[PDB]
Amino acid sequence: GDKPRAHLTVVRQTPTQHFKNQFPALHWEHELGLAFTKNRMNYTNKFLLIPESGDYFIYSQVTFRGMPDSITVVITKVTDSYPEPTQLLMGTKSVSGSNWFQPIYLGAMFSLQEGDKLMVNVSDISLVDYTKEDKTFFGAFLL
Amino acid sequence: GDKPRAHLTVVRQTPTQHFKNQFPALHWEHELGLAFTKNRMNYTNKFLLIPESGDYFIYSQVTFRGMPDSITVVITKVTDSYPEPTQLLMGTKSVSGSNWFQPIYLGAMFSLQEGDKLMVNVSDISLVDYTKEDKTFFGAFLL
């Protein structure tokens, strides 16, 4: 009938204040241009919020641009029932050419629960091409 | 019930006569081998034609082979209601090794309207590996 869906697009990222050595999460646009959310799928501050238990297809592309040794995208599942997140998908690539750019695309199916939160983490947030909605994006839909 | 679907595969491309500096669109096979269209999804001359308004998952891979500075795949939406197309998805990669090949894969979900047309554009049409249906392809399905 009316299934939860969202396609999110990149915006300008704010520099991260401190390093936990942790991979910082991307912020997203959720309603303008090609970005949308519908049918109870909520986007709040870096998280896609799962409204309904079921199997979802989740995808993301992050275009990296450099003007380190590797670039990495991870898609992460946060739940209240446990302090540590789960790494659902990882796209990791070694970087060898002083001016370069490269996309990383990830997509797969996962069983998710109502209340679960999804985020996209990257190795270095300053390498992320944020200049257009078609190059860096993040989405999910109930099957 | 019966949802619009198509999976298109690469054929031999005809050389583009003139350069608008524009990214030329690929031509596709639509019925032979692994290629098919069904449920009112029409393929005509480079375009997948959207028969029904709704949310679609769209994907493409283009394998590039070189025997420039970058290779680029864009998935583009054309509508009659506006002269300029919309860039839905862009996979762009810098090329640094005189003999090389590389795939670019893109997939995401978009709200589309009946009458919309989808095409795949590439930076350099002569770099496209066209030798087999499993390396370069283009598809879409209503969710």
Next chain:
Amino acid sequence: GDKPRAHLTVVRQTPTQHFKNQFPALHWEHELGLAFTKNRMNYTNKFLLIPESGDYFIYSQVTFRGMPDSITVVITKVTDSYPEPTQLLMGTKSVSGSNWFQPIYLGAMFSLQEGDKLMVNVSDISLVDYTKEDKTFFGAFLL
């Protein structure tokens, strides 16, 4: 209603005893961690087994790590009605930097028949990063 689905994750591969020059098939986890199969989709010894005729979305990522000239992932369809398999999807990349790693992602839609078997083949099985479920995986779902 209840549609066939599976998401499979990488395990430690056993070395292949002999070389047919053929691309060896990966083995997968099918029930632990993020791996699951449901609704009559069976995984047996390298094969996802198709229980129902219809259109499927199939995807795979294989992360390659090197500490050859190319790395290759193929998704292959085996049927009893014919001795030779069908290559549905191929992701192939030339390798140029003595320590490197690289993912290859493939996803597309195919018309499949009850009884069909799906496998993932790679060029060199010893290059496959098997260390975590989020880096190398294989899935399929009826649309």
Next chain:
Amino acid sequence: ETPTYPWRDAEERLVCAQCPPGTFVQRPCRRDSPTTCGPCPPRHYTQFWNYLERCRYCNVLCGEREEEARACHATHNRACRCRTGFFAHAGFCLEHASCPPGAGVIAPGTPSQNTQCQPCPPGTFSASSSSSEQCQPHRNCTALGLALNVPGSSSHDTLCT
């Protein structure tokens, strides 16, 4: 004369007027009424006559070494160009090149192309390796009242006595 479009009325097949740049179809035409064209909301634009039911989003962000060439306006998208000492090509935005001693600047660096160097034709020279210096002519010891003890084509002009 006014651009037009066909529409499926929730009643018939009628011929509605399109909307001008800076507007979109807020409401389709009716037999009674002409198209209601509403203004594009902030951060949105339509650059042409159209029958869009939603304006286009100003989706270009200027990044790295770039600044606004055009601002987001109701009739055009935002646009970005490479900065002063920078030019764009092949998808990247890299700093202008400098002409070495021997070649001169025949084309100054533009946000589009790179500084084009050309070796100076016999009778001229280029001292420095900057992207400003063009092909300057040699000293005339003849029409100055001296003698050409030493002359160098590549650089250094000439020394008279």
Next chain:
Amino acid sequence: ETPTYPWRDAEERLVCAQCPPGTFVQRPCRRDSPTTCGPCPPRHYTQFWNYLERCRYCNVLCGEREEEARACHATHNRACRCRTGFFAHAGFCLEHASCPPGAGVIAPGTPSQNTQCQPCPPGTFSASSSSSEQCQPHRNCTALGLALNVPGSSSHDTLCT
């Protein structure tokens, strides 16, 4: 003796005959009737006995530096090989290598392997750096009626007087 397959009749479980190379199952078998095997349409093939309900598509296109080894036939796919002065490996189709002065051709370039060079054993030489020249023997000034003023193993044969 004839290859066979099991089938779910729209009636029962019966045992139908398979179809020979160049054909496919146009209609399944029935208790009354044997399998109807129809011929593969143009640009299609079946290379083996089968019970496919559709022939396979000749899906190989020859590209770059390649030509047809086999044409698309009702009983086999199209096939491609690398051209005359070219060989294929690792997924690419690259031109044969030339043996430099000092090594000779023991294995001429085949559409499969590369031209294998081997340094010429004492008593032979290789003058040119082409992929045709093998290890040619030195001149015998002894059995010719001269004297060996100069001899070079690497190249240049020998000079007699």
Next chain:
Amino acid sequence: ETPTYPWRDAEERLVCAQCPPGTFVQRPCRRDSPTTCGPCPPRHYTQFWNYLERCRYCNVLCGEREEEARACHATHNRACRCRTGFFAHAGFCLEHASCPPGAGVIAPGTPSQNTQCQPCPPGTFSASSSSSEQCQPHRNCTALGLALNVPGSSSHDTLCT
């Protein structure tokens, strides 16, 4: 004091106790009964208080040049570290670096960092290019009863007579 969680009873809204490390919620709480915490199955773990309805899977495999730092336990995941002469960084696990003649080891190679070399301060030397040799002091011909015929700072200590 005991960590707690809210739950939708199949009856009401009640407040159930969480489960300790090494357990998971086998059955939710009921007004009558406290949470049933069951033990994590083999190859599974929970490291914290939780209300998971399934334990987490020990999903880390040690590979390449790695061995188990921690084993899979009911209260923790498996963990891997780089081997003896190896260290990990940026996602790879590569062998320790050796200090060349002139610099010495101030920090031995740890499974985490690389062997840090520092050039020896005037009065010391480093003979070999291994990752074991530190900055050793020069010979004193003064307090030994000889004379310093030759001294080298970079390596070779000194030669007395």
